[PDB]
mmCIF file of N, CA and C and ligand atoms in Angstrom:
data_model
loop_
_atom_site.group_PDB
_atom_site.id
_atom_site.type_symbol
_atom_site.label_atom_id
_atom_site.label_comp_id
_atom_site.label_asym_id
_atom_site.label_seq_id
_atom_site.Cartn_x
_atom_site.Cartn_y
_atom_site.Cartn_z
ATOM 1 N N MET A 1 0.307 16.520 -0.248
ATOM 2 C CA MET A 1 -0.053 15.230 -0.712
ATOM 3 C C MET A 1 1.356 14.664 -0.870
ATOM 4 N N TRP A 2 1.586 13.355 -0.848
ATOM 5 C CA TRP A 2 2.850 12.741 -1.061
ATOM 6 C C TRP A 2 2.539 11.262 -1.747
ATOM 7 N N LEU A 3 3.078 10.905 -2.976
ATOM 8 C CA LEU A 3 2.731 9.530 -3.360
ATOM 9 C C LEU A 3 4.088 8.695 -3.364
ATOM 10 N N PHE A 4 3.859 7.686 -2.651
ATOM 11 C CA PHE A 4 4.999 6.675 -2.307
ATOM 12 C C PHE A 4 5.266 5.425 -3.156
ATOM 13 N N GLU A 5 6.015 5.385 -3.949
ATOM 14 C CA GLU A 5 6.628 4.250 -4.770
ATOM 15 C C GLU A 5 7.605 3.531 -4.203
ATOM 16 N N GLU A 6 7.611 2.110 -4.576
ATOM 17 C CA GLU A 6 8.451 1.458 -4.082
ATOM 18 C C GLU A 6 9.954 1.880 -4.742
ATOM 19 N N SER A 7 10.913 1.565 -3.774
ATOM 20 C CA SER A 7 12.243 1.961 -3.835
ATOM 21 C C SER A 7 12.609 3.282 -4.043
ATOM 22 N N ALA A 8 11.615 4.282 -3.835
ATOM 23 C CA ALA A 8 11.757 5.594 -3.555
ATOM 24 C C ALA A 8 12.045 5.841 -1.914
ATOM 25 N N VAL A 9 12.241 7.108 -1.550
ATOM 26 C CA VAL A 9 12.446 7.487 -0.163
ATOM 27 C C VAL A 9 10.903 7.254 0.298
ATOM 28 N N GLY A 10 10.749 7.090 1.652
ATOM 29 C CA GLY A 10 9.837 6.592 2.225
ATOM 30 C C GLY A 10 9.102 5.360 2.180
ATOM 31 N N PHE A 11 10.004 4.377 1.399
ATOM 32 C CA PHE A 11 9.574 3.127 1.356
ATOM 33 C C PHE A 11 10.538 2.328 1.836
ATOM 34 N N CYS A 12 10.283 1.466 2.847
ATOM 35 C CA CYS A 12 10.941 0.807 3.917
ATOM 36 C C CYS A 12 11.297 -0.840 3.506
ATOM 37 N N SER A 13 10.381 -1.502 3.461
ATOM 38 C CA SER A 13 10.618 -2.897 3.231
ATOM 39 C C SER A 13 9.626 -3.665 2.684
ATOM 40 N N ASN A 14 9.623 -4.790 2.042
ATOM 41 C CA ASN A 14 8.470 -5.479 1.507
ATOM 42 C C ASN A 14 8.706 -6.909 1.503
ATOM 43 N N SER A 15 7.886 -7.858 1.834
ATOM 44 C CA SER A 15 7.854 -9.365 1.621
ATOM 45 C C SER A 15 8.047 -9.447 -0.084
ATOM 46 N N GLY A 16 8.443 -10.452 -0.655
ATOM 47 C CA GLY A 16 8.412 -10.948 -1.747
ATOM 48 C C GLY A 16 9.370 -9.833 -2.330
ATOM 49 N N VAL A 17 8.857 -9.760 -3.606
ATOM 50 C CA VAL A 17 10.120 -8.935 -4.640
ATOM 51 C C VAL A 17 9.250 -7.780 -5.325
ATOM 52 N N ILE A 18 10.070 -6.922 -6.039
ATOM 53 C CA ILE A 18 9.446 -5.683 -6.735
ATOM 54 C C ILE A 18 9.561 -6.443 -8.070
ATOM 55 N N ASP A 19 8.480 -6.106 -8.995
ATOM 56 C CA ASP A 19 8.261 -6.770 -10.385
ATOM 57 C C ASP A 19 7.539 -5.573 -11.276
ATOM 58 N N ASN A 20 7.835 -5.812 -12.292
ATOM 59 C CA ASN A 20 6.950 -4.970 -13.452
ATOM 60 C C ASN A 20 6.250 -5.569 -14.639
ATOM 61 N N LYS A 21 5.817 -6.877 -14.155
ATOM 62 C CA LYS A 21 5.395 -7.850 -15.190
ATOM 63 C C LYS A 21 4.010 -7.309 -15.771
ATOM 64 N N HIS A 22 2.988 -6.970 -15.037
ATOM 65 C CA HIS A 22 1.775 -6.510 -15.537
ATOM 66 C C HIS A 22 2.069 -4.939 -15.684
ATOM 67 N N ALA A 23 1.602 -4.220 -17.186
ATOM 68 C CA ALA A 23 1.719 -2.888 -17.351
ATOM 69 C C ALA A 23 0.964 -2.275 -16.618
ATOM 70 N N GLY A 24 1.224 -0.760 -16.539
ATOM 71 C CA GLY A 24 0.111 0.127 -15.863
ATOM 72 C C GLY A 24 0.309 0.567 -14.513
ATOM 73 N N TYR A 25 1.619 -0.103 -13.945
ATOM 74 C CA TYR A 25 1.860 0.621 -12.923
ATOM 75 C C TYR A 25 2.601 1.853 -12.981
ATOM 76 N N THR A 26 2.823 2.583 -11.723
ATOM 77 C CA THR A 26 3.438 3.909 -11.781
ATOM 78 C C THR A 26 4.988 3.696 -11.309
ATOM 79 N N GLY A 27 5.841 4.692 -11.323
ATOM 80 C CA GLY A 27 7.239 4.501 -10.516
ATOM 81 C C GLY A 27 7.644 3.309 -11.454
ATOM 82 N N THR A 28 8.717 2.676 -10.951
ATOM 83 C CA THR A 28 9.508 1.559 -11.549
ATOM 84 C C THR A 28 8.729 0.030 -11.502
ATOM 85 N N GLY A 29 7.501 -0.015 -10.913
ATOM 86 C CA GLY A 29 7.018 -1.244 -10.829
ATOM 87 C C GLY A 29 6.082 -1.373 -9.660
ATOM 88 N N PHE A 30 5.845 -2.308 -9.064
ATOM 89 C CA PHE A 30 4.889 -2.638 -7.774
ATOM 90 C C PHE A 30 5.625 -3.879 -6.658
ATOM 91 N N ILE A 31 4.999 -3.863 -5.696
ATOM 92 C CA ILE A 31 5.393 -5.148 -4.916
ATOM 93 C C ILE A 31 4.543 -6.199 -5.028
ATOM 94 N N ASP A 32 5.408 -7.511 -5.467
ATOM 95 C CA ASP A 32 4.461 -8.493 -5.350
ATOM 96 C C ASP A 32 5.107 -9.592 -4.502
ATOM 97 N N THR A 33 4.216 -9.466 -3.321
ATOM 98 C CA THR A 33 4.317 -10.527 -2.186
ATOM 99 C C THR A 33 4.682 -11.837 -2.340
ATOM 100 N N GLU A 34 5.126 -12.806 -1.496
ATOM 101 C CA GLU A 34 5.251 -14.254 -1.473
ATOM 102 C C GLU A 34 3.559 -14.352 -0.949
ATOM 103 N N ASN A 35 2.873 -15.526 -1.341
ATOM 104 C CA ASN A 35 1.882 -15.995 -0.971
ATOM 105 C C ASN A 35 1.669 -16.725 0.562
ATOM 106 N N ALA A 36 1.562 -15.853 1.430
ATOM 107 C CA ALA A 36 1.768 -15.896 3.019
ATOM 108 C C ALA A 36 1.276 -15.198 3.871
ATOM 109 N N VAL A 37 0.424 -15.744 4.891
ATOM 110 C CA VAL A 37 -0.035 -14.751 5.758
ATOM 111 C C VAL A 37 0.884 -14.057 6.582
ATOM 112 N N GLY A 38 0.454 -12.719 6.518
ATOM 113 C CA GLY A 38 1.467 -11.719 7.117
ATOM 114 C C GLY A 38 2.615 -11.107 6.363
ATOM 115 N N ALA A 39 2.552 -11.258 4.876
ATOM 116 C CA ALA A 39 3.063 -10.686 4.022
ATOM 117 C C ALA A 39 2.994 -9.235 4.048
ATOM 118 N N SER A 40 3.808 -8.491 4.157
ATOM 119 C CA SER A 40 3.721 -6.854 4.612
ATOM 120 C C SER A 40 4.755 -5.992 3.601
ATOM 121 N N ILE A 41 4.228 -4.747 3.852
ATOM 122 C CA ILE A 41 4.763 -3.420 3.321
ATOM 123 C C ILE A 41 5.017 -2.628 4.099
ATOM 124 N N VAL A 42 6.168 -1.930 4.218
ATOM 125 C CA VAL A 42 6.157 -0.734 5.474
ATOM 126 C C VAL A 42 6.769 0.533 4.602
ATOM 127 N N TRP A 43 6.046 1.655 4.935
ATOM 128 C CA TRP A 43 6.441 3.065 4.530
ATOM 129 C C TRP A 43 6.583 3.627 5.912
ATOM 130 N N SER A 44 7.395 4.963 5.725
ATOM 131 C CA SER A 44 7.594 5.980 6.807
ATOM 132 C C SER A 44 7.329 7.375 6.045
ATOM 133 N N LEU A 45 6.410 7.997 6.873
ATOM 134 C CA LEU A 45 5.921 9.557 6.472
ATOM 135 C C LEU A 45 6.074 10.336 7.314
ATOM 136 N N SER A 46 6.223 11.553 7.146
ATOM 137 C CA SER A 46 6.306 12.925 8.200
ATOM 138 C C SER A 46 4.829 13.383 7.695
ATOM 139 N N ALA A 47 4.094 13.998 8.841
ATOM 140 C CA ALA A 47 3.038 14.931 9.025
ATOM 141 C C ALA A 47 3.404 15.979 9.515
ATOM 142 N N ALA A 48 2.902 17.115 9.272
ATOM 143 C CA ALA A 48 3.174 18.519 10.027
ATOM 144 C C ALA A 48 2.196 18.838 11.327
ATOM 145 N N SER A 49 1.092 18.037 11.220
ATOM 146 C CA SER A 49 0.123 17.895 12.263
ATOM 147 C C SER A 49 -0.784 16.761 12.317
ATOM 148 N N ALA A 50 -1.056 16.371 13.697
ATOM 149 C CA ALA A 50 -1.866 15.246 13.973
ATOM 150 C C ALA A 50 -3.233 15.529 13.645
ATOM 151 N N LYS A 51 -3.865 14.783 12.647
ATOM 152 C CA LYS A 51 -5.012 14.603 12.204
ATOM 153 C C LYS A 51 -5.595 13.494 11.574
ATOM 154 N N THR A 52 -6.773 13.210 11.089
ATOM 155 C CA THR A 52 -6.829 12.156 10.119
ATOM 156 C C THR A 52 -6.469 12.393 8.539
ATOM 157 N N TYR A 53 -6.184 11.813 8.025
ATOM 158 C CA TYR A 53 -5.778 11.562 6.492
ATOM 159 C C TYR A 53 -6.278 10.704 5.722
ATOM 160 N N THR A 54 -6.743 11.034 4.362
ATOM 161 C CA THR A 54 -7.177 9.963 3.482
ATOM 162 C C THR A 54 -5.774 9.360 2.591
ATOM 163 N N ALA A 55 -5.862 8.097 2.649
ATOM 164 C CA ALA A 55 -4.834 7.417 1.807
ATOM 165 C C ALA A 55 -5.406 6.673 0.909
ATOM 166 N N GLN A 56 -4.647 6.692 -0.307
ATOM 167 C CA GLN A 56 -5.322 5.620 -1.372
ATOM 168 C C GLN A 56 -4.063 4.490 -1.915
ATOM 169 N N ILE A 57 -4.595 3.439 -1.671
ATOM 170 C CA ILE A 57 -3.817 2.240 -2.245
ATOM 171 C C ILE A 57 -4.030 1.936 -3.574
ATOM 172 N N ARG A 58 -3.068 1.897 -4.367
ATOM 173 C CA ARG A 58 -3.550 1.504 -5.765
ATOM 174 C C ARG A 58 -2.661 -0.001 -6.225
ATOM 175 N N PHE A 59 -3.404 -0.737 -6.591
ATOM 176 C CA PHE A 59 -3.119 -2.280 -6.590
ATOM 177 C C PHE A 59 -3.756 -2.959 -7.655
ATOM 178 N N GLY A 60 -3.203 -4.231 -8.102
ATOM 179 C CA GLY A 60 -3.549 -5.093 -8.960
ATOM 180 C C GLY A 60 -4.037 -6.349 -8.298
ATOM 181 N N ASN A 61 -4.878 -6.998 -8.768
ATOM 182 C CA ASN A 61 -5.430 -8.231 -8.208
ATOM 183 C C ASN A 61 -6.554 -8.764 -9.422
ATOM 184 N N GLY A 62 -5.987 -9.665 -10.061
ATOM 185 C CA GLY A 62 -6.912 -10.205 -11.183
ATOM 186 C C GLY A 62 -6.990 -11.844 -10.535
ATOM 187 N N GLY A 63 -6.753 -12.429 -9.477
ATOM 188 C CA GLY A 63 -6.456 -13.514 -9.014
ATOM 189 C C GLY A 63 -7.583 -14.028 -8.764
ATOM 190 N N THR A 64 -7.669 -15.381 -7.945
ATOM 191 C CA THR A 64 -9.091 -16.083 -7.861
ATOM 192 C C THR A 64 -9.782 -15.689 -6.646
ATOM 193 N N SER A 65 -9.317 -14.801 -5.828
ATOM 194 C CA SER A 65 -10.232 -14.348 -4.830
ATOM 195 C C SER A 65 -9.607 -12.932 -4.440
ATOM 196 N N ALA A 66 -10.529 -12.560 -3.381
ATOM 197 C CA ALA A 66 -9.928 -10.988 -2.701
ATOM 198 C C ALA A 66 -8.648 -11.336 -1.968
ATOM 199 N N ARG A 67 -7.885 -10.394 -1.747
ATOM 200 C CA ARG A 67 -6.628 -10.590 -0.835
ATOM 201 C C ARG A 67 -6.736 -9.626 0.354
ATOM 202 N N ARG A 68 -7.375 -9.817 1.330
ATOM 203 C CA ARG A 68 -7.495 -9.071 2.570
ATOM 204 C C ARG A 68 -6.472 -8.622 3.083
ATOM 205 N N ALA A 69 -6.015 -7.688 3.832
ATOM 206 C CA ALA A 69 -4.976 -7.109 4.468
ATOM 207 C C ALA A 69 -5.336 -5.926 5.205
ATOM 208 N N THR A 70 -4.675 -5.681 6.543
ATOM 209 C CA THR A 70 -5.088 -4.959 7.472
ATOM 210 C C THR A 70 -3.842 -3.911 7.316
ATOM 211 N N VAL A 71 -4.383 -2.508 7.466
ATOM 212 C CA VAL A 71 -3.493 -1.220 7.352
ATOM 213 C C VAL A 71 -3.115 -0.985 8.923
ATOM 214 N N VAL A 72 -1.812 -0.947 9.224
ATOM 215 C CA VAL A 72 -1.344 -0.767 10.520
ATOM 216 C C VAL A 72 -0.904 0.828 10.635
ATOM 217 N N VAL A 73 -1.088 1.708 11.328
ATOM 218 C CA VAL A 73 -0.607 2.955 11.362
ATOM 219 C C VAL A 73 0.380 3.033 13.027
ATOM 220 N N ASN A 74 1.329 3.421 12.843
ATOM 221 C CA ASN A 74 2.314 3.444 14.146
ATOM 222 C C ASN A 74 1.912 2.418 14.912
ATOM 223 N N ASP A 75 1.917 1.247 14.246
ATOM 224 C CA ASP A 75 1.959 -0.166 15.241
ATOM 225 C C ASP A 75 0.665 -0.543 15.694
ATOM 226 N N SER A 76 -0.498 0.110 15.259
ATOM 227 C CA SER A 76 -1.911 0.428 15.534
ATOM 228 C C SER A 76 -2.621 -0.360 14.427
ATOM 229 N N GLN A 77 -3.492 -1.535 14.419
ATOM 230 C CA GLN A 77 -4.603 -2.011 13.362
ATOM 231 C C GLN A 77 -5.467 -1.000 13.039
ATOM 232 N N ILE A 78 -5.704 -0.455 12.197
ATOM 233 C CA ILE A 78 -6.655 0.577 11.950
ATOM 234 C C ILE A 78 -7.754 0.013 11.337
ATOM 235 N N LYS A 79 -7.772 -0.675 10.248
ATOM 236 C CA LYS A 79 -8.926 -1.305 9.281
ATOM 237 C C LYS A 79 -8.363 -2.415 8.218
ATOM 238 N N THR A 80 -9.310 -3.307 8.108
ATOM 239 C CA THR A 80 -8.912 -4.225 7.012
ATOM 240 C C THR A 80 -9.535 -4.036 5.898
ATOM 241 N N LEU A 81 -8.834 -4.395 4.842
ATOM 242 C CA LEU A 81 -9.429 -3.757 3.280
ATOM 243 C C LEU A 81 -9.751 -5.008 2.606
ATOM 244 N N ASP A 82 -10.435 -4.888 1.615
ATOM 245 C CA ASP A 82 -10.851 -6.367 1.039
ATOM 246 C C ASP A 82 -9.688 -6.728 -0.003
ATOM 247 N N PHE A 83 -9.429 -5.459 -0.925
ATOM 248 C CA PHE A 83 -8.653 -5.639 -1.946
ATOM 249 C C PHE A 83 -9.340 -6.867 -3.022
ATOM 250 N N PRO A 84 -10.381 -6.499 -3.616
ATOM 251 C CA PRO A 84 -11.153 -7.506 -4.257
ATOM 252 C C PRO A 84 -10.381 -7.844 -5.697
ATOM 253 N N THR A 85 -10.674 -9.126 -6.230
ATOM 254 C CA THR A 85 -10.268 -9.369 -7.625
ATOM 255 C C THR A 85 -11.299 -8.707 -8.478
ATOM 256 N N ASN A 86 -10.679 -8.399 -9.890
ATOM 257 C CA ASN A 86 -11.559 -8.122 -11.100
ATOM 258 C C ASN A 86 -11.154 -9.210 -12.363
ATOM 259 N N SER A 87 -10.309 -10.001 -11.928
ATOM 260 C CA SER A 87 -9.913 -11.087 -13.106
ATOM 261 C C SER A 87 -9.387 -10.132 -14.172
ATOM 262 N N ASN A 88 -8.629 -9.341 -14.060
ATOM 263 C CA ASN A 88 -8.206 -8.280 -15.047
ATOM 264 C C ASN A 88 -6.948 -7.563 -14.306
ATOM 265 N N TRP A 89 -5.898 -8.009 -14.614
ATOM 266 C CA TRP A 89 -4.435 -7.444 -14.100
ATOM 267 C C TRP A 89 -4.207 -6.222 -15.187
ATOM 268 N N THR A 90 -4.949 -6.074 -16.048
ATOM 269 C CA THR A 90 -4.458 -4.712 -16.832
ATOM 270 C C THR A 90 -5.285 -3.499 -16.159
ATOM 271 N N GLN A 91 -6.220 -3.893 -15.413
ATOM 272 C CA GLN A 91 -7.038 -2.667 -14.872
ATOM 273 C C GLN A 91 -6.969 -2.711 -13.356
ATOM 274 N N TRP A 92 -5.818 -1.493 -12.913
ATOM 275 C CA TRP A 92 -5.423 -1.244 -11.596
ATOM 276 C C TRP A 92 -6.729 -0.687 -10.905
ATOM 277 N N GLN A 93 -6.641 -0.919 -9.639
ATOM 278 C CA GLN A 93 -8.039 -0.681 -8.807
ATOM 279 C C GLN A 93 -7.160 0.290 -7.505
ATOM 280 N N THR A 94 -8.129 0.999 -7.000
ATOM 281 C CA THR A 94 -7.736 1.968 -5.929
ATOM 282 C C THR A 94 -8.612 1.502 -4.800
ATOM 283 N N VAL A 95 -8.396 1.913 -3.499
ATOM 284 C CA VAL A 95 -9.163 1.776 -2.414
ATOM 285 C C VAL A 95 -8.759 2.743 -1.362
ATOM 286 N N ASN A 96 -9.397 3.663 -0.813
ATOM 287 C CA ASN A 96 -9.097 4.566 0.035
ATOM 288 C C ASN A 96 -9.397 4.225 1.548
ATOM 289 N N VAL A 97 -8.679 4.763 2.334
ATOM 290 C CA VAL A 97 -8.432 4.301 3.865
ATOM 291 C C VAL A 97 -8.240 5.757 4.638
ATOM 292 N N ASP A 98 -9.002 5.974 5.708
ATOM 293 C CA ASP A 98 -8.567 7.009 6.450
ATOM 294 C C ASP A 98 -7.925 6.523 7.719
ATOM 295 N N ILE A 99 -6.652 7.386 7.872
ATOM 296 C CA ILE A 99 -5.446 6.905 8.748
ATOM 297 C C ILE A 99 -5.390 8.202 9.705
ATOM 298 N N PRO A 100 -5.129 7.836 11.082
ATOM 299 C CA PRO A 100 -4.705 8.885 11.973
ATOM 300 C C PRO A 100 -3.118 8.863 12.112
ATOM 301 N N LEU A 101 -2.751 10.049 11.706
ATOM 302 C CA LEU A 101 -1.317 10.308 11.737
ATOM 303 C C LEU A 101 -1.022 11.517 12.830
ATOM 304 N N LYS A 102 0.151 11.186 13.568
ATOM 305 C CA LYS A 102 0.602 12.064 14.759
ATOM 306 C C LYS A 102 1.542 12.925 13.724
ATOM 307 N N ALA A 103 1.935 14.175 14.439
ATOM 308 C CA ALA A 103 3.005 15.183 13.970
ATOM 309 C C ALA A 103 4.280 14.696 14.132
ATOM 310 N N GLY A 104 5.146 14.576 13.010
ATOM 311 C CA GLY A 104 6.581 13.896 13.079
ATOM 312 C C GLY A 104 6.532 12.612 12.088
ATOM 313 N N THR A 105 7.094 11.934 12.532
ATOM 314 C CA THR A 105 7.567 10.367 11.860
ATOM 315 C C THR A 105 6.223 9.454 12.199
ATOM 316 N N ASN A 106 5.645 8.880 10.937
ATOM 317 C CA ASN A 106 4.482 8.074 11.333
ATOM 318 C C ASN A 106 5.045 6.539 10.547
ATOM 319 N N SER A 107 4.551 5.737 10.797
ATOM 320 C CA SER A 107 4.752 4.270 10.150
ATOM 321 C C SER A 107 3.407 3.762 9.368
ATOM 322 N N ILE A 108 3.419 3.536 8.251
ATOM 323 C CA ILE A 108 2.013 2.541 7.781
ATOM 324 C C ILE A 108 2.591 1.190 7.417
ATOM 325 N N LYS A 109 1.854 0.205 7.754
ATOM 326 C CA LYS A 109 2.335 -1.012 7.308
ATOM 327 C C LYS A 109 0.726 -1.751 6.434
ATOM 328 N N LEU A 110 0.978 -2.574 5.780
ATOM 329 C CA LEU A 110 0.010 -3.380 5.073
ATOM 330 C C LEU A 110 0.374 -4.653 5.292
ATOM 331 N N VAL A 111 -0.489 -5.487 6.026
ATOM 332 C CA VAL A 111 -0.197 -7.126 6.355
ATOM 333 C C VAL A 111 -1.381 -7.774 5.708
ATOM 334 N N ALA A 112 -1.099 -8.963 5.160
ATOM 335 C CA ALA A 112 -1.853 -9.936 4.390
ATOM 336 C C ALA A 112 -2.539 -10.655 5.487
ATOM 337 N N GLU A 113 -3.771 -10.939 5.411
ATOM 338 C CA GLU A 113 -4.522 -11.610 6.357
ATOM 339 C C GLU A 113 -4.804 -12.869 5.581
ATOM 340 N N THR A 114 -4.217 -13.316 4.452
ATOM 341 C CA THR A 114 -4.675 -14.660 4.183
ATOM 342 C C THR A 114 -3.489 -15.342 3.477
ATOM 343 N N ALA A 115 -3.531 -16.198 2.964
ATOM 344 C CA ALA A 115 -2.379 -17.369 2.287
ATOM 345 C C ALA A 115 -1.902 -16.556 0.912
ATOM 346 N N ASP A 116 -3.260 -15.786 0.380
ATOM 347 C CA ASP A 116 -2.704 -15.288 -1.240
ATOM 348 C C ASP A 116 -1.972 -14.339 -0.978
ATOM 349 N N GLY A 117 -1.572 -13.819 0.371
ATOM 350 C CA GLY A 117 -0.503 -12.342 0.361
ATOM 351 C C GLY A 117 -1.171 -11.010 -0.024
ATOM 352 N N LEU A 118 -0.438 -10.008 -0.315
ATOM 353 C CA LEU A 118 -1.037 -8.983 -0.795
ATOM 354 C C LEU A 118 -1.436 -8.922 -2.189
ATOM 355 N N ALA A 119 -2.408 -8.340 -2.551
ATOM 356 C CA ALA A 119 -2.340 -7.659 -4.029
ATOM 357 C C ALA A 119 -1.343 -7.208 -4.600
ATOM 358 N N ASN A 120 -0.929 -7.036 -5.561
ATOM 359 C CA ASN A 120 0.204 -6.288 -6.292
ATOM 360 C C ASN A 120 0.179 -4.851 -6.050
ATOM 361 N N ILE A 121 0.991 -4.321 -5.034
ATOM 362 C CA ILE A 121 0.708 -2.844 -4.620
ATOM 363 C C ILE A 121 1.595 -1.960 -5.286
ATOM 364 N N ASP A 122 0.939 -1.126 -6.256
ATOM 365 C CA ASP A 122 1.608 0.070 -7.105
ATOM 366 C C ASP A 122 2.232 1.070 -6.131
ATOM 367 N N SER A 123 1.447 1.568 -5.273
ATOM 368 C CA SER A 123 1.737 2.677 -4.628
ATOM 369 C C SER A 123 0.460 3.071 -3.242
ATOM 370 N N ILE A 124 1.053 3.939 -2.431
ATOM 371 C CA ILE A 124 0.383 4.534 -1.627
ATOM 372 C C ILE A 124 0.359 5.928 -1.733
ATOM 373 N N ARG A 125 -0.836 6.617 -1.743
ATOM 374 C CA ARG A 125 -0.816 8.056 -1.955
ATOM 375 C C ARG A 125 -1.765 8.791 -0.451
ATOM 376 N N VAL A 126 -0.881 9.791 0.156
ATOM 377 C CA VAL A 126 -1.473 10.188 1.438
ATOM 378 C C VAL A 126 -1.757 11.596 1.125
ATOM 379 N N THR A 127 -3.063 12.113 0.871
ATOM 380 C CA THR A 127 -3.582 13.338 0.658
ATOM 381 C C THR A 127 -3.547 14.106 1.975
ATOM 382 N N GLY A 128 -3.397 15.503 1.729
ATOM 383 C CA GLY A 128 -3.047 16.263 2.660
ATOM 384 C C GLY A 128 -2.049 17.412 2.570
ATOM 385 N N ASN A 129 -2.181 18.566 3.012
ATOM 386 C CA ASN A 129 -0.900 19.372 3.247
ATOM 387 C C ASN A 129 0.228 18.809 4.270
ATOM 388 N N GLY A 130 1.358 19.193 4.054
ATOM 389 C CA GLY A 130 2.442 18.821 4.994
ATOM 390 C C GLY A 130 2.616 17.502 5.101
ATOM 391 N N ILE A 131 2.495 16.366 4.214
ATOM 392 C CA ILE A 131 2.775 15.197 4.024
ATOM 393 C C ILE A 131 4.083 15.008 3.188
ATOM 394 N N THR A 132 5.234 14.559 3.983
ATOM 395 C CA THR A 132 6.463 14.255 2.923
ATOM 396 C C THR A 132 6.890 12.830 3.356
ATOM 397 N N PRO A 133 8.046 12.124 2.708
ATOM 398 C CA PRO A 133 8.561 10.941 3.178
ATOM 399 C C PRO A 133 9.618 11.105 4.267
ATOM 400 N N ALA A 134 9.699 10.128 5.234
ATOM 401 C CA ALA A 134 10.477 10.214 6.198
ATOM 402 C C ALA A 134 11.438 9.061 6.312
ATOM 403 N N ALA A 135 12.711 9.050 6.981
ATOM 404 C CA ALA A 135 13.757 8.307 6.899
ATOM 405 C C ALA A 135 13.190 6.578 7.368
ATOM 406 N N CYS A 136 13.621 5.601 7.020
ATOM 407 C CA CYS A 136 13.155 4.419 7.544
ATOM 408 C C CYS A 136 13.753 4.043 9.125
ATOM 409 N N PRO A 137 12.947 3.673 9.901
ATOM 410 C CA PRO A 137 13.761 3.491 11.330
ATOM 411 C C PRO A 137 14.863 2.197 11.267
HETATM 412 CA CA1 CA B 201 1.922 -11.745 -4.882
HETATM 413 CA CA1 CA B 202 4.435 1.628 -8.345
#
């Protein structure tokens, strides 16, 4: 498995800023995107073989609504996740999503579907053997 943090290898780009204002994150902080449709985060990973893997995204959302966003893998839309609010920025949340990966380098992007942008994204964890970070394109 590999746990991908902002500003660590495997992390490519993000809309908005990196921040640490709500305690409870892992690594240095989390991504706080601007409030815009299409706000995104991009990661790059390598997989030893082609199959479906479970990814888990850890996030904060204590805002007034869910912050729906689409998981894109290798330029293909895989699934839209809700990212619900719990009105509690001290309680980080997790959501699991299955993603098809190819052998070799893969891209994963998360893209905001609404004007509230993304939830604050702490990390993405991809489970399974043979997963490592990859260089950014
Ligand atoms: Ca934000
Ligand atoms: Ca983090």
